[PDB]
Design a protein around this ligand. Structure first.
Ligand SMILES: NC(=[NH2+])NCCC[C@H](N)C(=O)O
Length: 348
């Protein structure tokens, strides 16, 4: 399986994880000596090793999770490490569960959670897709990066109506175009230490790109962390409008680019935190009263299965659940939770 030199670095990595008595990553938690020993010499048919899985968590001890899938096969071959980490991270996605098939449900039925625009500055729904036939970042060749870019660029550039827009490859992009995209918060940068140590950024910026529509309500990142990160956003709180746009776009893309998908895990993504629906429906929202006590905000959000992140008392608040529920259900959890959070804010 894995080359002797790889196994050697794996042994050193296991020791580092043991050295880090302070470490709280799911990687440390589930990479017992037993599981390590059984997996350390294995290799997928494409050549991915346990090192290609855990290197990021070894290098960055402060990782929360600390593993990534280098190809789809890795989810199966290294299941003894992936499965419990997935179970632990995706709370409530049980051993006996399977992630449901795609179901966007009635996309137009979602409401404006803040019609007055008093709390929510903007609403965004994102998903991620891997492209069928291509492995994840660390197993991609330069040629695959470029071929993927060509296919995606051609597909996106043929979108019409609301979705009509412009594709910009990162390669050779001028500073002026960079500033324009930065000003709209459309540009992504080369991946951070977690992605670097996962070998997720090889050949950067080759095959990396950004697309947005004329209206600036639709944004796609190509080969940032996943092959496709697909995002619908607009000012205010109309989650119905946002989700409808996203689903329309994802459906249109799928006609030309089939996606990698798994019977149990749902849509396959590079990081296992993004599996299942992959959906992250969020508001950027100002809740000055509830934010007087950050710990209280966190507690209340969690009660309604919401996650609080950065994004001046302005929070990115999103659905916490990704696996074991439909896309419709995930957006609905965000919808209902935000409605309830706003009520709490008003009444405090
Ligand atoms: N962008 C992400 N996939 N974030 C979640 C994982 C981040 C990093 N690998 C960690 O374990 O903390």
């Amino acid at each position: 399986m894995a080359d002797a030199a790889v196994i050697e670095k794996l042994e050193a990595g296991f020791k580092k994880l043991e050295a880090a008595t302070d470490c709280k990553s799911l990687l440390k938690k589930y990479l017992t000596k037993e599981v390590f020993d059984k997996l350390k010499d294995k290799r997928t048919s494409l050549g991915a090793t346990l090192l290609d899985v855990i290197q990021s968590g070894v290098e960055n001890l402060d990782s929360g999770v600390g593993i990534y899938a280098p190809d789809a096969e890795a989810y199966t071959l290294f299941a003894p490490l992936f499965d419990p980490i997935i179970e632990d991270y995706h709370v409530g996605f049980k051993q006996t569960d399977k992630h449901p098939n795609k179901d966007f449900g009635d996309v137009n039925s979602f409401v404006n959670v803040d019609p007055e625009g008093k709390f929510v500055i903007s609403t965004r729904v994102r998903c991620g897709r891997s492209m069928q036939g291509y492995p994840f970042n660390p197993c991609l060749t330069e040629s695959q990066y470029k071929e993927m870019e060509a296919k995606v660029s051609s597909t996106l550039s043929s979108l019409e109506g609301e979705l009509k827009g412009t594709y910009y490859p990162l390669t050779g992009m001028s500073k002026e175009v960079q500033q324009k995209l930065i000003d709209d918060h459309f540009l992504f940068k080369e991946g951070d230490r977690f992605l670097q140590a996962a070998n997720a950024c090889r050949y950067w910026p080759a095959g990396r790109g950004i697309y947005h529509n004329d209206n600036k309500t639709f944004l796609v990142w190509v080969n940032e962390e996943d092959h496709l990160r697909i995002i619908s956003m607009q000012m205010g709180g109309d989650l119905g409008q946002v989700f409808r746009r996203l689903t329309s776009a994802v459906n249109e893309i799928e006609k030309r680019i089939p996606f990698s998908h798994h019977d149990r895990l749902g849509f396959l993504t590079f990081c296992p935190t993004n599996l299942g629906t992959t959906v992250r429906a969020s508001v950027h929202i100002k809740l000055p009263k509830l934010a007087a006590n950050e710990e209280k905000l966190e507690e209340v959000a969690g009660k309604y299965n919401l996650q609080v992140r950065g994004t001046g008392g302005i929070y990115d608040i999103s659905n916490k659940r990704r696996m074991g529920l439909t896309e419709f259900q995930a957006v609905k959890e965000m919808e209902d939770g935000i409605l309830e959070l706003i009520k709490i804010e008003k009444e405090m």
